[PDB]
Design a protein around this ligand. Structure first.
Ligand code: HEM
Ligand SMILES: O=N[O-]
Ligand SMILES: O=N[O-]
Ligand SMILES: O=N[O-]
Length: 153
C-alpha cells in the first residue's frame, strides 16, 4: 500500500515536525484557512478571524493545530495499522462536527506544502509521493468509517 521505504520517507520527514508540533500546526492551519476559507467555518472558537496576523496570534488555533498533527503523527507511526487511532477520529469528524472528506484533502495538501517549504532536504520527489499516499490512505480509511457512522462525507 505504502512500501517499507515509503513509510521510512514518511517517518523521516515526520521526525522534523516533532521538533515543533505547534509551529508546524499553525502553518498547516493558516495554509488551509487561506487556501480554503470555508474550512475555517468549521471551528466555532476562531471562525470570526479574518487575517493571517490574527491566525498567528490565536492560542486556540495553535492548540487545534497541535492536536491535529499530534493525532496524525500517531496514525502515521502505525504505518497503516491504525484502526484503533482512527476510530475516535472518525467518530468526532462525522457526528458533532461534520468534516467533509474533501476538507481532509485540503488539509492533506496543506501538510504536504508546509513539509516541503520547511524541510525540503527531507522531502524530495519520492518522499512527497510517499507522504501523499500515506494521507490518501488515512482519508480513505476515514471515509470508510464515515459510511458506517451514517455521514456521507
Ligand atoms: C489530518 C487531518 C485531521 C486530524 C488528524 C484531526 C484531528 C483531530 C483531533 C485529535 C481532534 C480532537 C478530537 C476531539 O475533539 O475529541 C479534532 C477535532 C475537530 N476537528 Fe479535526 N483533524 C483533522 C482535520 C480536520 C479538518 C480538515 C477540520 C475542518 C476543516 C477539522 C475540524 C475539527 C472540528 C470542528 C473538531 C471538534 C470536533 C469535536 O468537538 O469532537 N479537523 N481533529
Ligand atoms: O483540525 N482540527 O482538528
Ligand atoms: O505545495 N506543495 O508542495
Ligand atoms: O507559501 N509559502 O511557502
Amino acid at each position: 500500500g505504502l512500501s517499507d521505504g515509503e513509510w521510512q520517507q514518511v517517518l523521516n520527514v515526520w521526525g522534523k515536525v516533532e521538533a515543533d508540533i505547534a509551529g508546524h500546526g499553525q502553518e498547516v492551519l493558516i495554509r488551509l484557512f487561506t487556501g480554503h476559507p470555508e474550512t475555517l467555518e468549521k471551528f466555532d472558537k476562531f471562525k470570526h478571524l479574518k487575517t493571517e496576523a490574527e491566525m498567528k496570534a490565536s492560542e486556540d488555533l495553535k492548540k487545534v493545530g497541535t492536536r491535529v498533527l499530534t493525532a496524525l503523527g500517531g496514525i502515521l507511526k502505525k504505518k497503516g495499522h491504525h484502526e484503533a487511532e482512527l476510530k475516535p477520529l472518525a467518530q468526532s469528524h462525522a457526528t458533532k462536527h461534520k468534516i467533509p472528506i474533501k476538507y481532509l484533502e485540503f488539509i492533506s495538501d496543506a501538510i504536504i506544502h508546509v513539509l516541503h517549504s520547511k524541510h525540503p532536504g527531507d522531502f524530495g520527489a519520492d518522499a512527497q509521493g510517499a507522504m501523499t499516499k500515506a494521507l490518501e490512505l488515512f482519508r480513505n480509511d476515514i471515509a470508510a468509517k464515515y459510511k458506517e457512522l451514517g455521514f456521507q462525507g
